[PDB]
Amino acid sequence: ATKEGRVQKYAKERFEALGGLVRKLSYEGRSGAPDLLVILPRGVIWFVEVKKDENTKPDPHQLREHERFRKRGANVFVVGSFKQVDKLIEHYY
Amino acid sequence: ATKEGRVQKYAKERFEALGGLVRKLSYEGRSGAPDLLVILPRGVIWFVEVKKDENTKPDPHQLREHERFRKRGANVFVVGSFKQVDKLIEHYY
Fold first, then answer.
1. Other Cβ atoms closer than 10 A to A76
2. Domain range spanning residue B44?
3. From the CA of B28, how many Å to the nearest CA of chain A?
4. Would the keyword 4Fe-4S be found if you checked this record's keyword annotation (chains A, B) (predicted)?
5. For B81, what's the count of Cα atoms within 13 Å in the CB-facing half-sphere?
6. Is B21 part of the contact surface with chain A (CB cutoff 8 Å)?
């Protein structure tokens, strides 16, 4: 697809293999929502932003939105390659 | 505003008074997302659907989506009056 699209599809497949529900998120009347909402068993909720490669940072409005979430304790992760998806699961799940 | 709009605004204000971040949610290319994502301190995540009155049930696609979330342990609540917002906070927070 697109590079970003391929990483997103892999992530979706890995999370669904763990029993997770994956949704593509957007906000009504606001930008900056994380690309994926991931609902994993036992009430684990992850918000995952997907980028095209490991050197691509999220844009400024995205970064401020991730920090608003994390200040309150929410799980927000950024991945930009298949390896990063694999490390996220290994280390955080 | 609309009845549903007034309850939604009250809910937003009550959650923001607890330190919460409130967002109006939508999905890309899918319907049925809960009306509100609420991120409360200490990583508490609530999805809240708001209706115009206490007798209005969510539509069928919404109900199936709430159950997909709750099967995995997520917090999904439906409120349709100011009193229900108040009871939700009293009982669940």
1. 18
2. 1-93
3. 5
4. no
5. 8
6. yes
